[PDB]
Amino acid sequence: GKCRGLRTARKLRSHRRDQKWHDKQYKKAHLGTALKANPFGGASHAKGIVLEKVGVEAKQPNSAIRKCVRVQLIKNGKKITAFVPNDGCLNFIEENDEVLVAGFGRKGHAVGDIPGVRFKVVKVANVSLLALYKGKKERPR
Amino acid sequence: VHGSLARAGKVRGQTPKVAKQEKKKKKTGRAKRRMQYNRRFVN
Amino acid sequence: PVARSWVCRKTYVTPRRPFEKSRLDQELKLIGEYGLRNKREVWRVKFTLAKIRKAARELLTLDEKDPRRLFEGNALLRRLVRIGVLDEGKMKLDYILGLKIEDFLERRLQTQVFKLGLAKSIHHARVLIRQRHIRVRKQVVNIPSFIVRLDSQKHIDFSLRSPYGGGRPGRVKRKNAKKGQGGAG
Amino acid sequence: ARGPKKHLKRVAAPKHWMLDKLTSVFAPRPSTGPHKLRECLPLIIFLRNKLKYALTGDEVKKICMQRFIKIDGKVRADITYPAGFMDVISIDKTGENFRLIYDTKGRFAVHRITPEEAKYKLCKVRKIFVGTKGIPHLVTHDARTIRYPDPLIKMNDTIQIDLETGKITDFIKFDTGNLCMVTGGANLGRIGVITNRERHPGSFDVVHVKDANGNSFATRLSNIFVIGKGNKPWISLPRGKGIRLTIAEERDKRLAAKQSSG
Amino acid sequence: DTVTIRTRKFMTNRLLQRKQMVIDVLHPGKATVPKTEIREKLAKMYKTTPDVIFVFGFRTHFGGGKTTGFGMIYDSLDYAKKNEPKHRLARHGLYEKKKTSRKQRKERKNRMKKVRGTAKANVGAG
RNA sequence: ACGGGGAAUCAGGGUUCGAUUCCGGAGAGGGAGCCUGAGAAACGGCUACCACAUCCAAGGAAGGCAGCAGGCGCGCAAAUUACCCACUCCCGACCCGGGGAGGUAGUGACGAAAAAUAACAAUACAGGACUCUUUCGAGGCCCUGUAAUUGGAAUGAGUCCACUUUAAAUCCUUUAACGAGGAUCCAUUGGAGGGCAAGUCUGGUGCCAGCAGCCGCGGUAAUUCCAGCUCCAAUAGCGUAUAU
């Protein structure tokens, strides 16, 4: 059930150079089409303005209306949905605001009740969203 | 959206706004570990 | 093209399992007994004891009567006996594996000041060295992580400038005499 | 990339110069004298660190220019003049004379010698080179093209030149029963009798050597340098006599003298 | 006084005609006695003038004890004018340098390039 | 994807990374050609062409910051248009001039080593080895949890003169004059359902707000949300995002 020979080092090698492609944890990270469809250019964060403010429901077991934002990036000009993670911190978000967006916490997947949103908002017009909540900073009006 | 986005921070904003009391400065330093060792293994 | 020697490296190891209720419980039993500050003061010792056995083990893999083992091991044994953790004549490059954490902890200056009088509590000795009162046979040192060699084991006394030493009082006593003079008469 | 190199950086420079890492970036680049880089010793480093007569380049700058330094009989005037094997150097103001031969690890140990040994030197040959007009010619380690030698001079030999007019006197042939010191390579600076030269037509001719201490080693013919006849060296040797000691044995010597001179 | 100068690593630089040494101060707790006094005391131990003694680089140790510094002892006042580097000399002051600036000079030689060729054009302007 | 010396991770194998200060190669916006010179197909040298461009009397002239500082644009994202040639060596007709190569400064929580925020005592509570009573009662050498600075000693943070450091100053180091009573000199970042250390505590909210990496909590007693109190993790660091 193996090669195991002593002049076979090439076949053990051109087999594993072939069967690595079926490890989806490796096919994604080593094929140019996986990163291309990423709205980020592989970056950690990406700035971009806010072009509306919309809410999205939750999955079947538990009901709610998660609040979100329709952020358009400036890097690629794409359009993505960004969750606004905080308690009632949709009062500081406004149209044409240039918010900073980060990965949601599952390396390119949804999390929990939120359907189809993989992005959360960390800053809002160059002030930290945590700072606005706890009050340390203040967004000038 | 069906009718949403009207309520946001409904709970944070109607909870009572109670104030805090600052009495003892429990600085960590190292007497913390002196007494944090002396909560467990003194009894 | 700068001079700037950039050689540095960590000296502590983060435990693989963060919460165990038995590693946390026990490590305090070390900090509490020996008057440390934070877990780094313990893991740093775990690292030196890890290295000194990751080095001792490699020699044990090598057979005896060997050019590199016999010298490095004798040299390896030389520092341990010199530092105050192993008995002379208890050197065979095997009891090294029989060492435990506390043996490097017992030899620090902070603990050593406590055992040779010079203080009332193991914590009190620690504040003294940081107030620059204790001199290791010639020089006042304020480093409670000093690891004392055998020569410096019996040469530890108070300084010559300290208020506890043969010097003038500190600021507290000097000021009280002046403040007290108007206080009483 | 476009021509010669005129900046030698730090310990990228040869290791036997005994240099630091935090003396900035560069190192003195020898002036392309009578020896390769990887065998020489800049005259500047012989006056700051090996001797510690001076402090900086400047105090070395003013010494060599004041025309006190004497190398091979005629004074030099460049800060970085390459030194090399079997070179004699003299300091007339203080009154010492140095020999500059390799140690048992390879460091160009400081070696003070008598004025009698400060007259001559020992130089190996590289090719007997009969040239125009039927004139026999030689070449030596320090690029001395000597005309008109003793015809018996063939190869790998050692010559003795008075250091006023060259003019080889008292040569010793390469044989398989004579002392020889190894120069260059990992074996740098050991001494022993040859006892063999196993030829290899078309490659490096490997020369074994047995030491008077009973030990043995081997090198290639290039690294061999003959320094006397029989078991008698023409030159006095430093402490250790160029006899390699294992790091275990060298450890013993360190511990014994401890607390016995300071 | 209690300065208590001590000497180590002494060498007589005949090829420079000076003295090379290490000065080892032992101050029982003071302000690391200045270069003036140590130059004063060292002469009495060496039987010479305080004009010829020059010291450099006192780096005190920890704990207010032994303090180490270097010094060199020449023979002539002339000899210090060619064997001692300049900054070590004005440190007490017998030779103020040419120092005016660098960029002020550097700008000058460059703007000289635009008018170079005529002595009047060069020296007259600036 | 500049290659290599190397780097992170690890039981034995390995997997990933290497623009990055050392060695070697290519280049000065894209290409091509060439003079001087031993050594350039050099661009802080010339010649054209192309794109972008700066003065103009409209006739013409000049340039290449992928050098050190700077600003623009780009972005998730990267320093002050500061000092001099003293150590580093290099260049030159030369112990003597020049060096934004380099050093020195400033910014600097990328990162790494040591290390403050309390120590002591009597106080009155509090335990048990000790003390004596089978037993109650006791008085004492101790460990401490808490509260009064009750009280005298020790100190570094900070100011500030002088010395020391160094071309010139800068910080550490050394001796000054001051400089601690609880908010003085006020410690955080994340949690308390499970994994995973720690509240079946109180007020609010009512499948709402929201939390939650995952299993899941929220419809009147929420151990999970928002807060208060108490405790827990790491401690000048600690969460978040992505690559690994």
Swiss-Prot record, chain A:
Biased composition regions of type Basic residues, renumbered to the chain: 1-19
Q: Position(s) of the covalent cross-link Glycyl lysine isopeptide (Lys-Gly) (interchain with G-Cter in SUMO2)?
A: K36
A Pfam family name for this chain? Ribosom_S12_S23
UniProt's post-translational modification comment states: Hydroxylation at Pro-61 affects translation termination efficiency.
SUPFAM superfamilies of this UniProt entry? Nucleic acid-binding proteins
> Which InterPro entries does the annotation name?
NA-bd_OB-fold, Ribosomal_uS12, Ribosomal_uS12_euk/arc
Q: Which UniProt keywords apply?
A: Acetylation, Cytoplasm, Endoplasmic reticulum, Hydroxylation, Isopeptide bond, Nucleus, Ribonucleoprotein, Ribosomal protein, Ubl conjugation
- GO MF terms on file? structural constituent of ribosome
Identify its protein family: Belongs to the universal ribosomal protein uS12 family.
Q: How does it assemble?
A: Component of the 40S small ribosomal subunit. Part of the small subunit (SSU) processome, composed of more than 70 proteins and the RNA chaperone small nucleolar RNA (snoRNA) U3.
Q: In UniProt terms, what function does this protein have?
A: Component of the ribosome, a large ribonucleoprotein complex responsible for the synthesis of proteins in the cell. The small ribosomal subunit (SSU) binds messenger RNAs (mRNAs) and translates the encoded message by selecting cognate aminoacyl-transfer RNA (tRNA) molecules. The large subunit (LSU) contains the ribosomal catalytic site termed the peptidyl transferase center (PTC), which catalyzes the formation of peptide bonds, thereby polymerizing the amino acids delivered by tRNAs into a polypeptide chain.
- Protein name (database record): Small ribosomal subunit protein uS12
Q: What species does this protein belong to?
A: Oryctolagus cuniculus (Rabbit)
Swiss-Prot record, chain B:
Biological process (GO) annotations?
translation
Q: What is this protein called?
A: Small ribosomal subunit protein eS30
Record the organism: Bos taurus
Keyword annotations for this protein, in alphabetical order, are: Ribonucleoprotein, Ribosomal protein
MF annotations from Gene Ontology: structural constituent of ribosome
Region listing for Disordered, in residue ranges = 1-34
Family (UniProt): Belongs to the eukaryotic ribosomal protein eS30 family.
The UniProt entry's GO CC annotations, sorted and at most eight, read: cytosolic small ribosomal subunit
Relay the record's extra comment.
This ribosomal protein is synthesized as a C-terminal extension protein (CEP) of a ubiquitin-like protein.
- Composition bias (Basic residues) maps to 22-34
From Swiss-Prot, chain C:
Per the similarity annotation, which family is this? Belongs to the universal ribosomal protein uS4 family.
- A GO molecular-function descriptor: structural constituent of ribosome
InterPro entries xref list? Ribosomal_uS4, Ribosomal_uS4_CS, Ribosomal_uS4_euk/arc, Ribosomal_uS4_N, S4_RNA-bd, S4_RNA-bd_sf
The alphabetized UniProt keywords are:
Acetylation, Cytoplasm, Isopeptide bond, Nucleus, Phosphoprotein, Ribonucleoprotein, Ribosomal protein, RNA-binding, rRNA-binding, Ubl conjugation
Q: Quote the subunit structure annotation.
A: Component of the small ribosomal subunit. Identified in a IGF2BP1-dependent mRNP granule complex containing untranslated mRNAs. Part of the small subunit (SSU) processome, composed of more than 70 proteins and the RNA chaperone small nucleolar RNA (snoRNA) U3.
For the modification N6-acetyllysine, which residues carry it?
A: K65, K115, K154
Cellular compartments per GO CC: cytosolic ribosome; cytosolic small ribosomal subunit; nucleolus
The annotated crosslink position for Glycyl lysine isopeptide (Lys-Gly) (interchain with G-Cter in SUMO2) is K92, K138
Q: Which domain of life is it from?
A: Eukaryota
Q: Which Gene Ontology terms describe the biological processes this protein takes part in?
A: ribosomal small subunit biogenesis; translation
Looking up PANTHER family in the UniProt record yields: 30S 40S RIBOSOMAL PROTEIN, SMALL RIBOSOMAL SUBUNIT PROTEIN US4
User: Domain S4 RNA-binding: where?
Assistant: 107-181
Q: Where in the sequence is Phosphoserine found?
A: S152, S162
Protein name from the UniProt record = Small ribosomal subunit protein uS4
| Region spans: Disordered | 161-185
Q: Which PROSITE patterns match?
A: RIBOSOMAL_S4, S4
**Compartments in which it is found:** Cytoplasm; Nucleus, Nucleolus
Query: Which NCBIfam families would you find in this protein's record?
Result: PRK04051.1 (NF003139), uS4_arch (TIGR01018)
UniProtKB/Swiss-Prot annotation, chain D:
InterPro entries, sorted: KOW, Rib_uL2_dom2, Ribosomal_eS4, Ribosomal_eS4_C, Ribosomal_eS4_central_region, Ribosomal_eS4_central_sf, Ribosomal_eS4_KOW, Ribosomal_eS4_N
Keyword Transport on entry:
no
Q: Tell me a Gene Ontology molecular-function term this record carries.
A: structural constituent of ribosome
Domain of life (superkingdom): Eukaryota
Q: Where is the S4 RNA-binding domain?
A: 41-103
Question: Which residues get modified to N6-acetyllysine?
Answer: K232
Coiled coil segments of this chain? none
Q: Which UniProt keywords apply?
A: Acetylation, Cytoplasm, Isopeptide bond, Nucleus, Ribonucleoprotein, Ribosomal protein, RNA-binding, rRNA-binding, Ubl conjugation
The cross-link Glycyl lysine isopeptide (Lys-Gly) (interchain with G-Cter in SUMO2) sits at: K229
Record flagged with keyword Ion transport: no
Role noted for this protein: Component of the small ribosomal subunit. The ribosome is a large ribonucleoprotein complex responsible for the synthesis of proteins in the cell. Part of the small subunit (SSU) processome, first precursor of the small eukaryotic ribosomal subunit. During the assembly of the SSU processome in the nucleolus, many ribosome biogenesis factors, an RNA chaperone and ribosomal proteins associate with the nascent pre-rRNA and work in concert to generate RNA folding, modifications, rearrangements and cleavage as well as targeted degradation of pre-ribosomal RNA by the RNA exosome.
The annotated subunit structure for this chain is:
Component of the small ribosomal subunit. Part of the small subunit (SSU) processome, composed of more than 70 proteins and the RNA chaperone small nucleolar RNA (snoRNA) U3. Identified in a IGF2BP1-dependent mRNP granule complex containing untranslated mRNAs.
**What does the similarity note say?**
Belongs to the eukaryotic ribosomal protein eS4 family.
